Symmetry: D2
Subunit: 459 residues, 4 copies
Amino acid sequence: TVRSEKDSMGAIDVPADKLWGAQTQRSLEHFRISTEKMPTSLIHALALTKRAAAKVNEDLGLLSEEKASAIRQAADEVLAGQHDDEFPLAIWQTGSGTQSNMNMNEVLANRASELLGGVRGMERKVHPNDDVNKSQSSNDVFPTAMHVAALLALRKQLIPQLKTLTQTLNEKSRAFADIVKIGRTHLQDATPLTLGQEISGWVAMLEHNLKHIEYSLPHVAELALGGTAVGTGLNTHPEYARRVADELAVITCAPFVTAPNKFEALATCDALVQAHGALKGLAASLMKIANDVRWLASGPRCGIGEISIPENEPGSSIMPGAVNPTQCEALTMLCCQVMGNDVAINMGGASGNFELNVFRPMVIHNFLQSVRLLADGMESFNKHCAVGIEPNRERINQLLNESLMLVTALNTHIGYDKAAEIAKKAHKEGLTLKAAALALGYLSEAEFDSWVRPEQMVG
Amino acid sequence: MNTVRSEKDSMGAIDVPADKLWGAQTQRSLEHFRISTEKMPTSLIHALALTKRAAAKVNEDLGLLSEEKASAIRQAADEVLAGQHDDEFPLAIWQTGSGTQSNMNMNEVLANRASELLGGVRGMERKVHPNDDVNKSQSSNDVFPTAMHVAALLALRKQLIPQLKTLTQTLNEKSRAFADIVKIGRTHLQDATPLTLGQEISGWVAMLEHNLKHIEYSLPHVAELALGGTAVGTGLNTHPEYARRVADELAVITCAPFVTAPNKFEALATCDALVQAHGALKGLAASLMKIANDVRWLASGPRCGIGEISIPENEPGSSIMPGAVNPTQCEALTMLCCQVMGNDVAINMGGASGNFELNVFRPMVIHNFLQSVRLLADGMESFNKHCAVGIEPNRERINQLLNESLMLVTALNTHIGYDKAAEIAKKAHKEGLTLKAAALALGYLSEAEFDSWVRPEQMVG
Amino acid sequence: TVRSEKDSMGAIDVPADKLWGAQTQRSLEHFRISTEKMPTSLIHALALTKRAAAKVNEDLGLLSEEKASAIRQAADEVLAGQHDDEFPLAIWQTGSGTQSNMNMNEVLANRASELLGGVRGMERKVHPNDDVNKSQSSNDVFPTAMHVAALLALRKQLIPQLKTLTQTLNEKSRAFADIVKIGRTHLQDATPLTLGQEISGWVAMLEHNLKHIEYSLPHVAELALGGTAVGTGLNTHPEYARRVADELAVITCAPFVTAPNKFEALATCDALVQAHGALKGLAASLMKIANDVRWLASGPRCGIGEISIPENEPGSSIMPGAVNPTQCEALTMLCCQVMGNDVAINMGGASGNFELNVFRPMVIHNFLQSVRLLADGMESFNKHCAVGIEPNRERINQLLNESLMLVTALNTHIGYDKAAEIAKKAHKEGLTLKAAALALGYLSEAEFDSWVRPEQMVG
Amino acid sequence: MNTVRSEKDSMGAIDVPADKLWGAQTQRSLEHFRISTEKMPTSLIHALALTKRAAAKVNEDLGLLSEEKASAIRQAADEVLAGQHDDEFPLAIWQTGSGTQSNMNMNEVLANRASELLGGVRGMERKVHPNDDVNKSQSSNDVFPTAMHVAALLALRKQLIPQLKTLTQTLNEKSRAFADIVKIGRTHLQDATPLTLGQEISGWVAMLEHNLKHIEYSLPHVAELALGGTAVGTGLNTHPEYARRVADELAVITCAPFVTAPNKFEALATCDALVQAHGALKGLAASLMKIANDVRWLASGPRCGIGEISIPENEPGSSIMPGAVNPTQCEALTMLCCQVMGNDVAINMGGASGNFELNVFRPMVIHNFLQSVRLLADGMESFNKHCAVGIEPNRERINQLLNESLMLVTALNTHIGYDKAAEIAKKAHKEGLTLKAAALALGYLSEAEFDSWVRPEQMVG
């Protein structure tokens, strides 16, 4: 049921059916804080880092081919989802991520030993420190895994979903390009614009956010691996840092490079503080877009009601006709989450000392959460709401034509004085602009229909 | 003035403007921290003057300071409190993190002025001395935290709480006046079961009442004063009765319940009382944001929003937006509520960042804290007098929305059954009809029955 | 493998081996955002709310005894941990928590039907809406569960751990009450104080935080249940709101009361915004305490080194003698998390509209996380670090006696002028105060040992 | 002055001070928003004046405004830019959320002054008109966002970036000067493998270089101007060339790459460019916090801290703390870095809170943004000149710590083997000895061998 595993402090019992070792077991017993664990993206990035390190150590003649191949095979098993229950450690561990580094070293060593015909435990044929951690330090491995996970998540999840949502809204903007509606400034009725123009604002916001996110990628692509314990690379081959970045770039198909200054790479989380700045920008943009959608869809009768959205879940049986904007609610909630995550990241990033920033598990927990929230939130909002946005054309026209705002089209025909008189009379007596104008005898009905053309008021 | 006076400290001599009352340490801080434009607020300057006035009084009681000097220092401090010396305090927020330089600013101004009041002169021939007299029995480490708490407690008691009570009373009056006005409910921004406008406003009132209690709970900790802990909290180099006596004297002259801090190490090493008190202020900011947003959304119009209430129109609108009334008080209030949220983060970071015997993020913490108090107090005052006292229902619009909604259909359930009531609401929604038109079209009731049965005043409890 | 469950929108396939129904299934398919789910504390609070509602509905003659008992029995199974996999829904759902309310209604109805000899699915004998949700709305149920979970977590986890940590530090303060050490202000050497006095500051901070947290409890104890959809309580028995708060108080042994204003209770998360203000205060205090501990323990040779802390995990094999302050790192990280969580909560709490705040799942996700982090963090820091803090007496004395700070004891014997001269000479020439004083001939060695008594300098 | 002048707007007449140049709309805002003390910063006032100067120039080019009036408006705007009218802009940050009232403040001051420049008078008999002339072709909705971006881009280009470059150069010089000084590393606050002081400082340099790139990436979006979108973004009621022409004119007169925003709806409905640019500023704040903390911890002492570097002593220390040098520049800098973090939250909330065609959180957003720029620019300037240029190593203390540590023991591995080296380090740690004393006590090497083998200059790469 248990086996005895050892580290420099002594022996400790580990579950027989688990692949980790003594240091993982100590962390599991001493850091029992809350429920947040390393996310799968980060575990995979740690496995990729070890896979690349083993390949380079073999190329340099520092690690035998049979050991290096077995380590890479064990790492591929982690990436293939075969070992999710072998990583039991909390986010709230040592601030360098040493314990999760050792978790990977121990699981990979014990599994690689089995792949070479050996066993797990202290009789193993592959060793967590001398083999799996060769040429490495927790201090440079963990920030490498942080940047690998972050860059891949941005490239493979967030950016595709952002592009997909932008395309949907761009199609809606073109489809609704001719639909004139009332403007709203300060929440008050205002000069008209088209529904397509209003949506084009959302599109332009999402296009700008994509650029800002792309600008953050080169710094995240810089990897600490090869700085070792304090940034000097003491005890490493001079080609190791470049070689391992190159190998990570090959196996991930992403443009990883070695960090030109390893002291900055170890002492800070600056690349992620900056990249998260772009994500909180996206959260502010998505909050505004989601709010416009739910306010424009508010109703069915006592709100704005200019657009309809898909109804995907049963409504309340006592609220007839109501369609709750549930995707908008999930999206606005996660946008608040991203804003809070930014503060946590900023505090951790500001708090490095000397050669090492030791707020790393918390920083990456927040960063990767924000990426999941924004990527999955954009996917959900796109599929279940944005693709189905439709205008309520009769309601749009009713609001526009019963407003006071079309009165400006009369200025050039009867003068601003009488046009203002028409608007004040309509407002005071609760009439339409046309009715007030006819009551005053300032024009005929034919003149009003010829002069007041909303389609000529949106240029 | 171009002409200078040479002032001295332990570092040497430095030129100060001849027409100013400060000394060498103020001048060095002025010259070395040319960072942005934020200076100590008047409330903090006054709190420092009160602290020196009380310290001089107690030093006289204890036989440590002559009556002549103590009276002159008191008179100089009273001139500061009367607004006669605002331009004698030129230092930035972004100075030493203990606020020592502003402590020395007060010591130097009071000493130079007290010297003049005794028939002497300002400068190095002065008869009253900034360190030996005005700072007697004190440390920057215990004076600046004391002034922080004096300024904070007085601002909460004299500005914020009275304005909170006034706005609460106004909204309570409105809730009573509008207690019988039934309106449509809104949940998720969608039409919902009715409630009265008075009931909705009663929620705003209850929020402000709860906020008052939370703010009151934070006052006892702010009332604890560091004065007497001296440099590191031990009280070394002060009379054993000084801490209690000076807190008592501050309580007498301010009419506020100041007490000496029971643990001077917590008092010097942290800003915890202000971190906690600001937590209650960000709670108030979240409540005011919601109230202000309800008001501006309910007033939105004139024709393409909600329009259930009207608000006073205080500044001319845009000539090209006929009939629009921008909710400008609501905008100022929502903006300052965002500011309070940001201020809370800055305070939390400073409060989390003490080391060993002293927190040295103090000017920044008090800058943010006193700003939030000014914003919330003056914002509630302005919103009350320029908006809240004049909120009025638009009764015809309220009834139009209610009567054209689908939500009154539940009143039919007991009369014709849920199945036929649901059928009426579905037909009305699908065909764009009122409930009455749909019910009549199906032949399920008469017009008189609809008018007798569908009574919103019976649907609000 | 599947069964067909129905709601007002139609039929949907649900796993045959699961107890939820149609609305849970729709949420599971439409809100696939990230990995955060309702925490167990909130699921239990939802079950307690349904258990209390069923009891009161039975007391009022609105629900049959056999149905009410079966619902309570099913709820007890949830509380006993038998159904954790029956609650699959994301935090990032509808902002009122309707979907999790329906998750509980459906699981309890299907299970209670089995307890009455029936089956799960559409032939069930107990019904999610007409039975399990009787007299209730998602709008008042979810904020009730939020406050039940929050108050119980504060009372049963956070406050006990805060008291335990305070007691440990109080014992350390008394044990070290006579150990004089150098003060530090601005990070510079300063007037002496005892190690016990310095620790007494930490104790007083924790005592103050307890009071602030206690002040927040009465508002959290106010429950929305009985306000129904908009706060008016339309369609409820007039005794229901008081009766259900009373029943929750009985079954939880906590002082729950009905909210005196149901409009405030539905339209805001104000009680939790305020209570979280006290938690971020605690986070700022714990950050400072944890930083003092790790700085005081820094070394082994090139830091401060005035205290030792337990070494619970093996150190780095290339950093001989180093003991990383790993509990301090976990604690400082989670304190940053609480600060970020406060921002997310504040944004959600500021964002109510009209009759309902629909940021609720996000608010409670953050609030309950902060409670777990602070409670478990205090437990971990206490057990694995604080209980083992010990002074390094020789190092403390070396720093104190080699400093310049004891020179003030000479003022009353030789005058401030010569005492200042001694300190400047020692500083300039790198001597001890005693050596500089003897070189100047200002006293004898016997006089220095009689006059310079650190034990007389801490009052 | 007590005497008043009656000024009029569409709401009626209101008294303004006779000695002031503003008009009715300014006076109403002044009277109705008595909230705290924060006003528009001078940078924003100047940006508004530049916007009006460019608008008048283009209106003249297009034949819409007489040469006489356009020249007078330009002259009045140049007086504002020259600092002659700072007391003509009395309005609070906490005003209408569009900044309309400050737009009108500029329109009224420029019109009244331009009238005087044409031989007329201020007041209702003026020859130049605030709305018809000074605001011609414009809206508050497009003017205030334009001034926000003009002020922000110029402050980043002219103040922040030059000070960032200067501090970076200073630290690069220090890193080169100290490239050969080996010191103890510190990870987790524990003694660690050595590196040079130059290498450690090179990390600070690389941080500041990366921050410069991030800030530069944010500039193109801030350079996009809303002017020409008019009330809702459509450009209704403006010449089709106005948007491009005014952006071009602003680019000429400021020597900055302003362009018209390609989507005016995004430009009016959001503050997204400033949300994103402030993200880069909070990154810089986190970097500067770390650098400032390294400096003050490395300078801590004089005898009971680290003490590896010395910093300039600029203000006299406490008389009771002999030898202490408080790192006051580091304290001001760490405080302002906390402020930037809080400012970011306030900006994010305002930026997330637009509705429909207009974001009306603008005064608050720009108040915070321009404050962060002043704080970071002036803070880097002050830290550089009063601290960074004078950082020096304490070479004997650096060597003392290094030689008394356990960390040099790895240099023995190749000479005596890992097992005996580990034994030496364990004995030294357990018994309180230097590595050399422990190695000699065990008889594993001679003193000459230790001195020849343990070479820190070979342990830093």
